[PDB]
Amino acid sequence: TARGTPSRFLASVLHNGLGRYVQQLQRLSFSVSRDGASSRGAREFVEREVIDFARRNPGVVIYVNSRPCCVPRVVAEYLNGAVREESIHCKSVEEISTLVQKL
Amino acid sequence: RQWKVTSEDLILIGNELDLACGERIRLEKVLLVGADNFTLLGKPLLGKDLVRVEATVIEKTESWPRIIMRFRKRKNFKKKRIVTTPQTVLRINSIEIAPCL
Amino acid sequence: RSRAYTPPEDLQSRLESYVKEVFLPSNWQDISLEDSRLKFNLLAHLADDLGHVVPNSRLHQMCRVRDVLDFYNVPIQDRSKFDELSASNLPPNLKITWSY
Amino acid sequence: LRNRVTDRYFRIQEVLKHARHFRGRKNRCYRLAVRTVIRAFVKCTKARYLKKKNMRTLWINRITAASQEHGLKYPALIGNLVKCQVELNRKVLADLAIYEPKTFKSLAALASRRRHEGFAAALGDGKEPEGIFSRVVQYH
Amino acid sequence: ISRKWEKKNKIVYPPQLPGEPRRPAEIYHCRRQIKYSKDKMWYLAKLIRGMSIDQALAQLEFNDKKGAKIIKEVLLEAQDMAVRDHNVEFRSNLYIAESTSGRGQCLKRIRYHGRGRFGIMEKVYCHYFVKLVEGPPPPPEPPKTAVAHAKEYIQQLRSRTIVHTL
Amino acid sequence: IGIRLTLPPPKVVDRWNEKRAMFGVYDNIGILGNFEKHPKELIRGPIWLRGWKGNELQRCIRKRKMVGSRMFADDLHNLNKRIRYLYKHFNRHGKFR
Amino acid sequence: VKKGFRAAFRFQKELERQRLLRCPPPPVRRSEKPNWDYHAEIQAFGHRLQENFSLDLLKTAFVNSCYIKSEEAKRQQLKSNQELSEQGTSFSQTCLTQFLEDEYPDMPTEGIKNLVDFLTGEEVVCHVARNLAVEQLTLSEEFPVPPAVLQQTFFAVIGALLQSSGPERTALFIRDFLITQMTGKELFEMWKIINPMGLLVEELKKRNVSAPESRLTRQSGGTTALPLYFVGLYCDKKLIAEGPGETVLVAEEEAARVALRKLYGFTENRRPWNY
RNA sequence: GAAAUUGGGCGCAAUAGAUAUAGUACCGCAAGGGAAAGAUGAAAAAACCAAGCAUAAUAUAGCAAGGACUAACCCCUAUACCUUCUGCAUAAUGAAUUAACUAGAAAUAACUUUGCAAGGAGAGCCAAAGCUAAGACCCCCGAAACCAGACGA
Ligand SMILES: [Mg+2]
Ligand SMILES: [Mg+2]
Ligand SMILES: [Mg+2]
Ligand SMILES: [Mg+2]
Ligand SMILES: [Mg+2]
Ligand SMILES: [Mg+2]
Ligand SMILES: [Mg+2]
Ligand SMILES: [Mg+2]
Ligand SMILES: [Mg+2]
Ligand SMILES: [Mg+2]
């Protein structure tokens, strides 16, 4: 609800639209298991579309870690220091490609 | 809806605008332009020859997770649903005006 | 032992030299391999010299010498996915590590 | 007990994280919390119809407050801004009255000129030429 | 069972810099399983909760309750500990910062009632925790004057915005 | 607070045990062993259900008939009471008729 | 003991979140954390700002002076920052006055110099530097990076951009990141003035206009604890400003501020900056 | 309801599993009923999480919240839940609260999916597309009683 949860005012980071638009992602960090069915779509995202993604915005520096995890995570870090760590566990390739473009 | 819009401000719309972040957008359908000493107001819109309201796109977020719960007493009727409506944020860059009167 | 195989540039005449050793006639690419011994002597000479054996799943697909020619001019390359990704012309903000 | 529930702690905290700001034992005891957390969620969605009602009632009470400063009533302003095809809604008209009172004085001047053009057309029945601000713009 | 209050006297802070004010001593002390109830101890623990240790020993010598004879045994052992073990030079330079009472492990006996029915009588026990901080006691908070109520009202008028608009 | 504070010791399962690596051998001893043995002769368990599947009433009827002559004295009385109960449940109670 | 593993694992990770909500750790800088490559973050630093640097000359803009001393201290157990930071501080002072003397010509050189000291102060630059990932890339000794060093690192980036792409691209880098920090801010929230009534007598004497006669235009509830006055500043019986206040002295001290804004061109309804 | 005839664990792990640490303590004249519970470490010859409280009593107004808000309350909106009913805020039932335990068991026929097919099925049985195999539907607590055998004046 709204009386339980905090609230804020609609703002931007550093007047993000006035002079120029600065892309607000700094990093994406993928943990992706080499053997594991939970990261089946996450392996196909790295194989197919993370190279098309890392050229569409050269300000985001992307780290694919590739360690033996059960749950693959994506750790989006932004320009104001905020960290939004989300999971791509058992998601198809079309569902990670919109989850990352949302980030 | 109708947004009272000045320059260098922000607007939050509750739908995806199928745009890229950063694309400058000319908002048509201006229907009242005012200054400290005059105002011009259309019938019902001002012409495109007269006003040019620019807007960038900053962020294409989702809303905060926003609950829909249904309940009826003594009927075992209880539903819960959590929706996040997609949102976009426009920054109005300039309200130019041209002498076409 | 290494699974990698590059098709030689003269495998057209290298296979033709092995057909003339196991037999010769005109249109040498349409010789039917219906004989069990004749398919053995041809494919053992190719697998020993070139170092690439026909798998049991693909051994029945070879009814002609045309089909033996098509198998030996496709390049297989079995390397790790680390070496496949990190040598696939990464843009300068892709960093890939392997904890294995 | 072959398989009994091992994760019942996290099902309680799905409800009890919404109740942390309550009073009494509704913030602690789970049996008392679900009858209020459910009831706090139904009120959260039934008040999406009352926010749009209570904002428009607020906008009407802020247009009625500012139109009385120029001697207009509320139905004499909205009814004659429509007749000039000035399709401003209640949100902007209540935000013009606070933040731009010169423009709102011009909309009260326009809605009173059209009102006087509506009376002068009505007292002079029969065919008379229309008022100046009473001419509609047609779209085809 | 837990005994975390006894272990707070073993925290060793790093040795101080001379460009830093002197850290006051803290002396955590407790007695467990006092045959007295935990909410009859609260009236004695609330009484001494801001006082200096010499005024606390004065107001407990003349209280008629049972626990005042027990707190005065706790406050005297914690004052003797502060000059011995925790390096306070003055006995009089202490005040009670925290003075609470938890419940202890209570025993159960049978109380017979007037018929075949009965009740379950519980023999109450309690704890008493104290912390002495080295220093003079801080002064009690005065009531906020009419100047301070007028500032808060004018600051509440000054802070209000035009709500539900631009 | 019914949840443990320390995570349990790790379950090490040898997937190449004797009973695991040779599991399933001779389940087709009929159809490629000249049908001398049925695979129902390969299952080891109680006498009254070596190659037989029934519900709870048909199991207690079969246990009383096959091995009930040598059952213990208050295990036979606990079984006779169970068939006397499961008769009345399956034949008189229930939703569908 | 309820058998199983998946619920005992989740509770082990809800205890570790509560161990950081009860005892939060000290902040560690970004380079001592996983997933960090210092060469790749600088090339991503350039393309993020839609501008291109000479990447070796940008690498020397981030290494400070205190870092080289404490890199030689641990060597018992590189260029500095000052050259590029002096070019960037000196240019962005003359670039910002050229921006503000062109948009506000009526403002005096006292008020322009007090505007550049706001736009290049520690409150604006170290707020701008923390949201362009300059603290992440800077090489200092102590963390969090002190605002005296982070301001030196930010102007070294502008100094490095001057040598990379000339003074045309660099003035657009100052226009988009330093001049945007005055949006919505009043003039005297940037240029704090003691005695604005006496500063208005000096400026009205500059235009050869009469000294203003402060006149009480409107008032309400003078005998209460919540009064409202409207002191207007009339000169030659024509007002230049009116101002509100709780008393007459505040409403007169504020009516000089409204007339000072109307003289220097810094009103609330002035023409906004062009981008 | 016949007969001829035919021939070690996809268990429990201290409210579980035995009632069982024990048929002990305790209860009854007796037959009989019948519990509860323990957790260090290689060696003792070495924290964080329930209810409940405390830290820290309370400020006009009302199902204890929600919309909100600069702001905890003030403003506006809102007649707890379950069960039973024509219909319950009902002044109808149940419930102090926490932790744990506590309630849908199966047939022919149909359906779905395979195998094989005028045949199917590892004898028996069915078959005018059938037949074999699988999957999928049938609760918990509660009387006053009745009878048999002991134990009690
Ligand atoms: Mg009691
Ligand atoms: Mg027979
Ligand atoms: Mg037991
Ligand atoms: Mg608690
Ligand atoms: Mg009310
Ligand atoms: Mg009713
Ligand atoms: Mg009731
Ligand atoms: Mg009833
Ligand atoms: Mg009751
Ligand atoms: Mg007698």
Side-chain angles (χ1 to χ4, degrees), chain G residues 1-3 11 15 18-19 22:
Chain G
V1 178
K2 305 175 178 189
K3 61 191 194 192
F11 196 64
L15 285 174
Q18 291 161 5
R19 279 182 198 104
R22 183 201 52 187

Side-chain angles (χ1 to χ4, degrees), chain G residues 10-170:
Chain G
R10 282 188 68 195
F11 196 64
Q12 196 55 235
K13 293 200 62 49
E14 302 297 328
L15 285 174
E16 284 180 21
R17 296 171 201 185
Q18 291 161 5
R19 279 182 198 104
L20 296 193
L21 261 183
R22 183 201 52 187
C23 171
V28 170
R29 81 186 75 180
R30 197 45 193 86
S31 201
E32 264 84 68
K33 298 218 252 194
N35 294 330
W36 172 261
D37 189 21
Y38 187 74
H39 180 44
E41 297 266 350
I42 288 177
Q43 307 183 339
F45 167 74
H47 298 301
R48 183 181 303 134
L49 306 173
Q50 284 171 6
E51 283 171 348
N52 47 359
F53 297 84
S54 280
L55 276 306
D56 186 282
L57 201 133
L58 179 57
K59 268 206 173 197
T60 196
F62 282 120
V63 44
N64 285 281
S65 317
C66 59
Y67 184 73
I68 313 181
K69 302 310 188 69
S70 202
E71 267 211 291
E72 285 214 294
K74 50 165 158 155
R75 206 176 265 175
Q76 275 150 339
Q77 300 175 340
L78 274 174
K79 269 187 237 178
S80 160
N81 211 10
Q82 212 273 313
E83 273 61 60
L84 278 188
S85 156
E86 186 180 0
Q87 308 188 4
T89 301
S90 156
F91 167 70
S92 65
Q93 268 159 18
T94 76
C95 175
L96 272 173
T97 64
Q98 272 318 111
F99 271 133
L100 294 159
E101 286 188 12
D102 214 40
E103 194 83 56
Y104 312 128
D106 277 308
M107 200 159 286
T109 178
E110 175 166 52
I112 281 156
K113 198 202 278 274
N114 274 111
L115 275 191
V116 184
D117 283 26
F118 180 73
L119 296 184
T120 66
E122 77 273 29
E123 186 177 0
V124 159
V125 157
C126 302
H127 171 51
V128 164
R130 281 165 201 155
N131 303 338
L132 294 186
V134 173
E135 202 168 326
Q136 300 201 350
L137 284 173
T138 180
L139 310 159
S140 79
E141 182 180 0
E142 303 139 13
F143 194 78
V145 170
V149 172
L150 185 73
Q151 182 192 339
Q152 186 170 6
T153 316
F154 180 74
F155 281 131
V157 170
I158 302 181
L161 184 43
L162 189 130
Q163 294 171 13
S164 278
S165 200
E168 275 219 300
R169 290 303 288 276
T170 307

Side-chain angles (χ1 to χ4, degrees), chain A residues 1-4 7 9:
Chain A
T1 54
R3 284 174 86 114
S7 63
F9 277 105

Side-chain angles (χ1 to χ4, degrees), chain F residues 1-3 5 19 30-31 35-40 53 55-56 58 82 85-86 89-91 93-97:
Chain F
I1 324 166
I3 182 148
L5 272 302
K19 265 163 206 146
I31 79 178
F35 295 91
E36 294 170 359
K37 286 193 96 58
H38 206 281
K40 86 187 149 197
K53 179 193 196 291
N55 59 344
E56 210 201 330
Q58 286 167 332
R82 188 86 183 137
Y85 171 69
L86 287 165
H89 173 70
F90 283 143
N91 302 334
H93 305 320
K95 180 189 188 184
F96 299 115
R97 277 160 182 86

Side-chain angles (χ1 to χ4, degrees), chain F residues 15 17-18 20 28 36 49 61 64 70-71 74:
Chain F
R15 300 281 177 201
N17 200 1
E18 186 59 27
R20 263 183 205 106
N28 303 129
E36 294 170 359
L49 45 90
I61 284 164
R64 187 176 67 184
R70 53 174 211 166
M71 211 178 293
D74 51 335

Side-chain angles (χ1 to χ4, degrees), chain A residues 22-35:
Chain A
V22 174
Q23 169 78 274
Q24 285 294 314
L25 260 182
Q26 302 195 31
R27 279 169 297 272
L28 285 169
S29 291
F30 292 89
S31 279
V32 160
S33 164
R34 173 194 84 198
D35 302 329

Side-chain angles (χ1 to χ4, degrees), chain D residues 71-73 75-76 80 110-120:
Chain D
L72 280 178
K73 296 188 181 172
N80 300 105
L110 190 137
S112 38
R113 169 71 181 271
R114 181 53 181 85
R115 211 209 182 209
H116 294 328
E117 287 183 345
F119 295 134

